[PDB]
Amino acid sequence: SLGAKPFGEKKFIEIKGRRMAYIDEGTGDPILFQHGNPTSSYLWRNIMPHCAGLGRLIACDLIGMGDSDKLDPSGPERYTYAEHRDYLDALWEALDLGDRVVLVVHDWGSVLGFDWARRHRERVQGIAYMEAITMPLEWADFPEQDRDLFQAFRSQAGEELVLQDNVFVEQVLPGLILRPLSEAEMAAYREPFLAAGEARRPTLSWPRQIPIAGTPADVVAIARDYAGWLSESPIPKLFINAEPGHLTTGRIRDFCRTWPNQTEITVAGAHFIQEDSPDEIGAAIAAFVRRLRP
Ligand SMILES: [Ca+2]
Ligand SMILES: [Cl-]
Ligand SMILES: [Cl-]
Secondary structure, eight states: OOOSOOSSOOEEEEETTEEEEEEEESSSSEEEEEOOTTOOGGGGTTTGGGGTTSSEEEEEOOTTSTTSOOOSSOOTTSSOHHHHHHHHHHHHHHTTOOSOEEEEEEEHHHHHHHHHHHHTGGGEEEEEEEEEOOSOBOTTTSOHHHHHHHHHHTSTTHIIIIIITOHIIIIIHHHTOSSOOOHHHHHHHHGGGOSSSGGGHHHHHHHHHSOBTTBSHHHHHHHHHHHHHHTTOOSOEEEEEEEEOSSSSHHHHHHHTTOSSEEEEEEEESSSGGGTOHHHHHHHHHHHHHHHOO
């Protein structure tokens, strides 16, 4: 159902000198849920219950997000994709995931998850994705309504928008959810970002890292690599399409629809579709996992 209560209890682990927070419930092969910007493990709270008893249910808070530690010192060159990947790779290693991992990804969680999967293909049993970066982007893929704002994030205006005014949390997040959020839900999303300044850096560094029109070149290359791989991989996939959807529409949806061994369902939502259709999403993931684990 819907609801503002988190799933499970937050656990903590030291990774590269910083404390990272994660949810880890149950036993067996992992079903690994990865949030992106500007969210946390909290995004999956109404979805994870649908997988009860199908394996070890894991949702990690990316560095500087959720209940994970902030980088110290924080600044404009921190919280790059490469930096997030170093922490997340190390956390996933520390969690002893084994070699039959199901990945469930969204937003920046998909760039991280798709890349990790490409680098650890023998260990990936299935990939479920939604509102994901399925390939390097162009401004034409960006919904027209968001072009100017994201271009502004990727300019000197970004610091005032995000660090001073918390625009990603306070404007973009609810703007891309169809149903109204409760007070408790917004409180959970804003909690890691209550303080103005560097506490909010992850939510600005992320849009600056989106592979668009060839920049940044490193992230473009990573996305190009996993795009090629996924388009040829026989790993079972679940594509949760959204209507109206947001990011994964047009050209980049045309592209991910070419991926082999893929089941697709459509649910109601814009970008943060987990807040609109958690039960339909969880039910689909559960059925996917049951077929993977008979
Ligand atoms: Ca809304
Ligand atoms: Cl096993
Ligand atoms: Cl972003």
